[PDB]
Design a binder for this molecule. Sequence first.
Ligand code: HEM
Ligand SMILES: O=C(c1ccc(O)cc1)c1ccc(O)cc1
Ligand SMILES: O=C(c1ccc(O)cc1)c1ccc(O)cc1
Ligand SMILES: O=C(c1ccc(O)cc1)c1ccc(O)cc1
Ligand SMILES: O=C(c1ccc(O)cc1)c1ccc(O)cc1
Length: 444
Amino acid sequence: LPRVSGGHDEHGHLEEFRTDPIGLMQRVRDELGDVGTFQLAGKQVVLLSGSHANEFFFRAGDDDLDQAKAYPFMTPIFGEGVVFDASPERRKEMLHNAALRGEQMKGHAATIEDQVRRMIADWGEAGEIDLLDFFAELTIYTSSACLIGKKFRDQLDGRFAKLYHELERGTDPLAYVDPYLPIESFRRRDEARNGLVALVADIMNGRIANPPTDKSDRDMLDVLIAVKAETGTPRFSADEITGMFISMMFAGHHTSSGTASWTLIELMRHRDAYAAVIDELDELYGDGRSVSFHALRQIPQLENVLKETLRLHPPLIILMRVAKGEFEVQGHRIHEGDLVAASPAISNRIPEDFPDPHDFVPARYEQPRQEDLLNRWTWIPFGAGRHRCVGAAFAIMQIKAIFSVLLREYEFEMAQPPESYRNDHSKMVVQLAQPAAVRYRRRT
Ligand code: HEM
Ligand SMILES: O=C(c1ccc(O)cc1)c1ccc(O)cc1
Ligand SMILES: O=C(c1ccc(O)cc1)c1ccc(O)cc1
Ligand SMILES: O=C(c1ccc(O)cc1)c1ccc(O)cc1
Ligand SMILES: O=C(c1ccc(O)cc1)c1ccc(O)cc1
């Protein structure tokens, strides 16, 4: 198995992975094709790209390509003392049944709409915001309100959002060496989790001390608190509930937050797309129906802008797995213990599949191009096959709900040069580099 160039010998490509992971992965493809390798210290990473190789990846059962130990940076976050022994598929199943059922979508759209109005309540006539600060906080509220419950969300304040952020900043790729290296970002990460457990414990004690007289406001915290082990003792501790809540929201927070920011960035970068979306929204809402109604149904132009934003700026730039056995892909041998990865960042821009891959072209999703549909295994912002993101429908609905409100009320423009808006790839969790100042003005 040949490796990409530039390896720093002993450390391999670890340092490049911590600064320019996309450049590294792209060089692996440019140099080795659909199957190449790079190393993170002693760990071997087999990087797959292209339709054939990606299909292998996405059709692989968790018994051949395990997600289990593929993301060591998450263990200290969900919590060591956790019973996350539920197959990643079991987890997806529980989350779905609890908060992602189709019949729940309309209520979620209304919740999200409400949360957005609450966030822009004091915006006034005009001003400026930082995209990361705004969307990171907004999605903490939409996520908690929808996935856990409005009652729970209402018991939260800025502290929760700030601590959660420290969790995401605690995902330095060095976790592939040791998730407990004595570095400050990992220390802040561990303190942040203890801070979150404390906030939840406080709320828990309040729920237990004064049981909800109502019942129609009952949320996921109430549900978890009531569960009893066979011995008859409460099944979950504040620590486990916190871990479960963190897990419920993690995959959906930074992805939705970053996607909302980039959707607005691309709209502002392309004046004609922006105009097209504004006219579409105006016409659409002119029928007098609600956001909860329209956000669940098609909004063509805004959706093609979202699909293109996702193709160019996928929030998860690399998907990881650990080979549980011996495999072979296009002649390249994969060994047990090897890390195996797929990359939306790289695959979403393969020129043979997506002409002019670096250009923003929403029309590539209209007929007859329908590039997302004709390139199932390479258009993968949400993954594909059995590992397709379980929150996709929710994420799509949220984006529509969020912008239906924002773009109908305010108009935005960059407060910085267009090139200044970019991602920070120093942690496994991608987020906008700051500042990302944007000016807003109430629409007349
Ligand atoms: C535009 C935003 C989103 C993008 C592009 C995205 C992307 C992805 C991708 C590519 C994966 C599979 C990664 C892998 O195989 O390791 C994934 C998994 C997952 N996504 Fe999403 N996602 C988004 C929003 C959300 C939302 C809003 C939710 C929650 C309602 C969510 C919940 C999940 C879950 C539960 C998993 C599996 C990880 C776990 O069990 O903790 N995603 N997502
Ligand atoms: O960055 C590393 C590192 C560890 C292994 C390797 O091959 C290259 C670099 C690091 C960070 C903090 C420490 O305390 C010790 C090593
Ligand atoms: O509702 C849940 C649940 C909690 C967290 C999560 O990420 C998914 C589902 C639940 C209910 C009863 C149980 O015994 C255990 C979990
Ligand atoms: O946020 C995650 C994540 C990883 C495992 C999990 O159970 C939930 C979320 C992530 C971050 C960076 C990546 O490259 C891939 C996934
Ligand atoms: O069909 C979509 C889709 C993606 C964005 C949008 O605005 C509407 C539909 C899709 C494709 C593949 C996935 O894995 C998840 C959703």
